[PDB]
Design a protein around this motif. Structure first.
Motif, PDB file in Angstrom:
ATOM      1  N   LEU A 146       0.801  -1.189   0.000  1.00  0.00           N
ATOM      2  CA  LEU A 146       0.000   0.000   0.000  1.00  0.00           C
ATOM      3  C   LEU A 146       0.885   1.313   0.000  1.00  0.00           C
ATOM      4  CD1 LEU A 146      -3.047   0.830   1.952  1.00  0.00           C
ATOM      5  CD2 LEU A 146      -1.288   2.441   1.976  1.00  0.00           C
ATOM      6  N   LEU A 147       1.853   1.363   0.906  1.00  0.00           N
ATOM      7  CA  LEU A 147       2.590   2.573   1.149  1.00  0.00           C
ATOM      8  C   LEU A 147       3.526   2.830  -0.006  1.00  0.00           C
ATOM      9  CD1 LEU A 147       3.615   2.303   4.930  1.00  0.00           C
ATOM     10  CD2 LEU A 147       2.052   3.916   4.112  1.00  0.00           C
ATOM     11  N   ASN A 148       4.077   1.753  -0.589  1.00  0.00           N
ATOM     12  CA  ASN A 148       4.943   1.909  -1.752  1.00  0.00           C
ATOM     13  C   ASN A 148       4.149   2.410  -3.006  1.00  0.00           C
ATOM     14  OD1 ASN A 148       7.502   1.226  -3.626  1.00  0.00           O
ATOM     15  ND2 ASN A 148       5.743   0.100  -4.320  1.00  0.00           N
ATOM     16  N   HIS A 149       3.008   1.799  -3.333  1.00  0.00           N
ATOM     17  CA  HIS A 149       2.114   2.306  -4.398  1.00  0.00           C
ATOM     18  C   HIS A 149       2.010   3.836  -4.290  1.00  0.00           C
ATOM     19  CE1 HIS A 149      -1.720   2.952  -6.703  1.00  0.00           C
ATOM     20  NE2 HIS A 149      -1.199   1.978  -7.431  1.00  0.00           N
ATOM     21  N   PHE A 150       1.800   4.406  -3.090  1.00  0.00           N
ATOM     22  CA  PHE A 150       1.622   5.853  -3.135  1.00  0.00           C
ATOM     23  C   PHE A 150       2.865   6.722  -3.107  1.00  0.00           C
ATOM     24  CE2 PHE A 150      -2.574   4.009  -2.336  1.00  0.00           C
ATOM     25  CZ  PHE A 150      -3.398   4.687  -3.083  1.00  0.00           C
ATOM     26  N   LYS A 151       4.057   6.138  -3.252  1.00  0.00           N
ATOM     27  CA  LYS A 151       5.246   6.935  -3.477  1.00  0.00           C
ATOM     28  C   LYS A 151       5.125   7.665  -4.843  1.00  0.00           C
ATOM     29  CE  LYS A 151       8.733   4.511  -1.174  1.00  0.00           C
ATOM     30  NZ  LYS A 151      10.023   4.508  -0.605  1.00  0.00           N
ATOM     31  N   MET A 152       4.661   6.931  -5.859  1.00  0.00           N
ATOM     32  CA  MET A 152       4.602   7.439  -7.210  1.00  0.00           C
ATOM     33  C   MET A 152       3.198   7.824  -7.621  1.00  0.00           C
ATOM     34  SD  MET A 152       7.813   7.865  -8.256  1.00  0.00           S
ATOM     35  CE  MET A 152       9.406   7.405  -9.132  1.00  0.00           C
ATOM     36  N   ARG A 153       2.146   7.360  -6.956  1.00  0.00           N
ATOM     37  CA  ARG A 153       0.830   7.873  -7.334  1.00  0.00           C
ATOM     38  C   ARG A 153       0.363   8.997  -6.384  1.00  0.00           C
ATOM     39  NH1 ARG A 153       1.976   6.697 -10.362  1.00  0.00           N
ATOM     40  NH2 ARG A 153       1.730   5.538 -12.319  1.00  0.00           N
ATOM     41  N   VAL A 154      -0.530   9.893  -6.831  1.00  0.00           N
ATOM     42  CA  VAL A 154      -1.078  10.956  -5.969  1.00  0.00           C
ATOM     43  C   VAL A 154      -2.180  10.505  -5.033  1.00  0.00           C
ATOM     44  CG1 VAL A 154      -0.356  12.837  -7.557  1.00  0.00           C
ATOM     45  CG2 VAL A 154      -2.808  11.998  -7.704  1.00  0.00           C
ATOM     46  N   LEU A 155      -2.216  10.967  -3.784  1.00  0.00           N
ATOM     47  CA  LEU A 155      -3.454  10.702  -2.973  1.00  0.00           C
ATOM     48  C   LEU A 155      -4.595  11.677  -3.307  1.00  0.00           C
ATOM     49  CD1 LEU A 155      -1.382   9.493  -0.049  1.00  0.00           C
ATOM     50  CD2 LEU A 155      -3.420   8.347  -0.728  1.00  0.00           C
TER      51      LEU A 155
END
Length: 170
Positions: free
Chosen positions: A91-100
């Motif tokens: 989960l946390l890695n996915h949002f390194k490169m995607r925007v919340l």
């Protein structure tokens, strides 16, 4: 930079939404800083993230745990958005490169330091919330909780209460 398997370090047991919104709203905190804490939905966790300087500044995300696989071969998945992830590292890695909403996870929140002390007497502690320490040991004060007892952090990152009078401010 943050290591998505040390997530257990960016988790703050006990901190409320409001606490975290106040810590992350401070003006020196940069975009993409975040922490994790108890969600106010019973049982769950949430992610709190400084995502802009104008407009809405702090976002809050519910993270929902699934049920583990009956098999007994599970590890319950985690969900944020409609996005499922077999766990928290992922989960946390996915949002390194995607925007919340307006930003991306960038660095884990650490409380800033308001004093460097060196301890003048061994403290062994009386409560589980105390922080033990050796005479001569260097510690970072983060908060002056009351007059006699302050919140401290040590070299290994562990936090708790020390007695003001067993420590000498630099």
């Amino acid at each position: 930079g943050f290591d998505p398997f040390e997530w257990r370090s960016f988790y703050f047991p006990g901190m409320s939404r409001e606490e975290a919104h106040k810590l992350l709203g401070e003006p020196q905190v940069s975009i993409g800083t975040f922490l994790m804490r108890d969600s106010s939905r019973p049982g769950e966790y949430s992610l709190t993230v400084r995502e802009a300087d104008e407009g809405n500044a702090v976002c809050h995300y519910l993270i929902e745990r699934g049920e583990p696989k009956e098999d007994g071969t599970a590890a319950a998945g985690v969900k944020i958005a409609n996005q499922s992830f077999p766990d928290i590292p992922a989960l946390l890695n996915h949002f390194k490169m995607r925007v919340l909403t307006e930003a991306s996870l960038l660095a884990a929140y650490k409380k800033p330091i308001i004093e460097v002390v060196v301890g003048t007497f061994k403290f062994t502690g009386e409560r589980e919330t105390d922080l033990p320490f050796e005479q001569g040991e260097r510690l970072e004060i983060l908060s002056k909780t009351n007059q006699d007892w302050w919140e401290a952090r040590n070299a290994l990152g562990t936090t708790g209460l020390v007695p003001a009078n067993y420590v000498q401010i630099q």
